[PDB]
Design a binder for these strands. Structure first.
Lengths: 313, 314, 314, 313
DNA sequence: TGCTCGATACAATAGGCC
DNA sequence: TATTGTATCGAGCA
DNA sequence: TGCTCGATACAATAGGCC
DNA sequence: TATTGTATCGAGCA
């Protein structure tokens, strides 16, 4: 019941820490904010413009807001990170590509529209930390920024309150009427996403399933990274997906299937749950086939950020 | 440099967790309180009635208030701790006696008179966690108890606000005029506690130091546990300290030495700093000699909780 | 190449922090005069006393089961956890206090039953007056002579197998042999190696035990033979008796029927700390068969076979 | 008390080790050689061709032979030791100038006519790679060299066996008739060395002693380094001692005393014991006054290495 | 239908590295 | 991290 | 000088983490 | 990466 919320919060604030001042700053933001109708995520993997994998310290999905602790390079529990400058809206802390290759299956999202606030814990680093008065000031301004964000969304009636029990349940989206990219939709299994579009399934094996009420649309469950069978990628923008095969012959023979098959795909990408290391499937949008190269394989572009959902037949 | 405060706070809330719900409860208490005139300590070692060594998750020394998270029983392997029942005002979590004699060097205080507030994190135990609203309520009432204790202290004019810069500097205690147990006075070395009483000392490596302004008292820096040369103990309430030695012969030769004088000793116990593991010296009181013997041998009873200080002597 | 492993080994063995005053001289002299590096040796070897305290010997030849200990009565050592005491003749005169014995539980601690101990008395008489180098060199020489006679006693029986660093921790050595014995003093770097002696292809193994692929009645087991948070396990000083219990009695009641009808034989490799460099290693204790379950005291595994047969990968 | 032997031997072989292979090589040499009629010293401080202070790992005084192990730059237990190249028979391991400034008082000798043998741990001239057995071969060769040296001296009857009990006793020296550098003589105190020349002293506190049996000689107990009162030096060959004062007034007022004073001095320098660091007095030689000036001070040249002794009068 | 087996999901953790 | 056992659901076969 | 030990510096190893 | 174990420095004292 509510205990699920309790456990979830505890676990998010109980991760092994990457930065020295992370735990303090995030815990103070959460506790002072004191709004648990707001879902948050800690150590959220994101993808930068340059395709390197990064992360942010605290992430509110509903508001599209990130919060990042700036310690500079010196003090890091993980020497597995690196400190660089990037686009204004992108984090300063990155993962080395060597271990970003083992982080493929992890849940990695797109920050394009999102805002990032920084907390500066060092006055004239290296060395001396800033006084707590300043840090508390930054944290307070951030907190009220968050609050005004939430109020802006409720005023636009685009804000859906967070419920643990209903969020992984297909019926809630069937009732809602749409699965939206902005509602941050992730479902526990393939059978569930199938059951949003009119299937009734005990469970589902396949890597794709035909959409019942649209013949030109295919429900797709790809790994958006490279695996043994397929080499797939998705741009930081979220707009461009490429689909190729580790064997070129399979690609060449997939050309015909792609051009003559369903031209639209509803994509649910397989991602590891950030807690509990488990299979999950996140809604990436409605994509339309564009062209099939032999070299670059298949290229799908995203026409829609929301799809209509249906009751079973 | 107000950065010392920041470092201190970060490191107190940055300890490796003993309990699963510890970080949450403590961090929320601190932030929602957010009064930093209040000094606090996490994972404070305490000494129960029995000789067993226990610990509390959050501790305010100025108010004599502890906060313990109760989960009881699962303690997140793999901890050296154990879940037991004890005196009403004492913690539920203790350490195995085997691991207790390992931790002797640690700074272990007396909880006599201190209040302990608990936070119950499980509705149906074992297993299921409770709802956040309830936990938050428990924490809120604890915060109110803290604030009202702070108020009953400030209005009685017994409250001394916390300062990092001045608390380890002897000059401030010379200016204050006294050193008390309520003040919770711990100094970083022997030379400082010596310089409190009128010494100019640059370094002091000896165990005892002759009191400049009083010839019946001795400044003492004992280890209150067993070590290489001699065996010392202190009662859980901090009333009585027993002095002995490994060799019975040197106890015999030191027996007459004890019997003639000096008959009083002001005590600072050598204790490891709760942060950064270096030696420090904590005022235990002003103690008086009651007895000579074998075995338990010398016995020092505590007759005073406060000692006056003195300017350097030239 | 890789003949530098022997160098590093010898340097590090003769290079430990000294436990005694005269240890280094005696041991170094013995090694250098012996000049046989086909004989593996160990310094400061931890041994299991019948009194159950931990003791140590200054020099240990495993292949010969022969120890050498230097006798300097009492005092002459400053500030170590060691203690002088009397025991059985074939047991050392130096031990660890029970308090620090339980802190050393994880270390490699061996049964000395059957092993002979030679002593070197370095003082003519008490007070620390040293004995002239003449009779000391005499003692060392007769010791070395006895050592060579022992090695000769083994080589004519074709029991003796020369020492090789590169092949001693390699499973394939013992698969070719094809037996693992106590006489060969076998210890492996990891569980997966142990499993790959008996017919497994494992790349890595994190599990507490694995079924014997070619024997349905036998289980490969990697116990901690001391107490930890999950289990309470003991092994007799002669290694003939191993007791297994669980800290919790609910875990305990669940394991009784599992044991009584489960596989009745266990090939045991105990988890021990490396004597140099402190990494986990696994020492073959024997093949034990289940003799009992009495539920306050847990399972009793008695030692039947001192040798086990290996197998090429399946 | 033949125990003093064993205590000396274990205390020499039991010093805090400077080098990684030092213990093994030295111990193997000593135990395999097995000749305790030969006095030896470990970590013996020496003075190089330059003013710099070096050390050798093993030293046989009687034979004038040193033994040094070469492990090179790294594997240093002491970070203040340096690795360089120097004169033909000179050690390769030195001490930093400032860290040798606290080492002034140590017993530092002249290596001029001394042979130094190196154990090459890693590799040797002509370039061959080595470990273990090759090291052993080197050690064995060295042992042989030592023996042939001893025999060479014992056939010329220049060899004198080591006895720990009498060697610090003035009586043996007043008995054999001569104190010389060949015997490596250092006593425990000033009263002893004075009693060697015929004084009866129970206790002697003074910087110099007028010789009973010669009016032209002066027994002297200098610190051959710089201290608060004096600036004194001695050349690496041991042939030249310079004496100056901290104050110039004292120097000028000592100039007349030098030119008109007794013009030859018997020098016993004040050096710390290599074991226990007690003050002891080593015989440098019989030096004759040569020259003086303000600018660099007084200059003494060594005329003779053998002084006659005398019975108390 | 009832059995055998294989792919997938998932929990558990020694080993090695920081 | 990387590896393997255990539990589960479905495909395949008799 | 010569001795004694707390404080300090730095290597050795215990612990956290993937 | 954080804590513990070992060696060195140096003020105070006889």
């Amino acid at each position: 019941a509510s205990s699920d919320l309790t456990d979830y919060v505890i676990r998010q604030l109980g991760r092994t820490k990457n930065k020295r001042y992370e735990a303090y700053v995030v815990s103070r933001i959460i506790h002072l904010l004191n709004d648990f109708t707001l879902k948050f995520v800690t150590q959220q993997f994101v993808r930068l413009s340059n395709k390197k994998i990064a992360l942010t310290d605290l992430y509110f999905p509903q508001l599209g807001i990130h919060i990042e602790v700036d310690e500079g390079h010196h003090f890091l529990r993980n020497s597995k990170m690196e400190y660089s400058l990037n686009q204004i809206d992108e984090p300063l802390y990155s993962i080395s590509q060597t271990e970003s290759d083992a982080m493929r299956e992890e849940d990695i999202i797109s920050i394009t529209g999102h805002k990032i606030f920084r907390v500066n814990v060092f006055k004239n680093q290296e060395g001396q930390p800033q006084n707590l008065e300043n840090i508390h000031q930054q944290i307070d301004k951030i907190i009220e920024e968050i609050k005004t964000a939430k109020n802006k969304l409720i005023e636009a009636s685009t804000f859906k309150e967070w419920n643990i029990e209903t969020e992984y349940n297909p019926q809630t989206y069937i009732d809602l009427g749409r699965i939206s990219l902005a509602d941050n939709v992730v479902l526990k299994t393939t059978k569930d996403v199938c059951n949003c579009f009119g299937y009734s399934y005990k469970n589902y094996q396949r890597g794709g399933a035909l959409h019942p009420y649209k013949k030109d649309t295919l429900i797709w469950f790809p790994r958006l990274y490279e695996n043994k069978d397929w080499i797939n990628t998705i741009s930081p923008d979220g707009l461009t997906i490429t689909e190729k095969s580790t064997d070129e012959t399979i690609t060449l023979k997939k050309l015909e299937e792609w051009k003559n098959g369903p031209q639209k795909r509803i994509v649910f990408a397989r991602v590891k749950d950030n807690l509990s290391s488990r299979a999950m499937y996140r809604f990436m949008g409605l994509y339309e086939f564009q062209k099939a190269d032999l070299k670059d394989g298949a290229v799908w572009k995203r026409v829609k950020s929301e799809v209509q959902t249906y009751s079973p037949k």
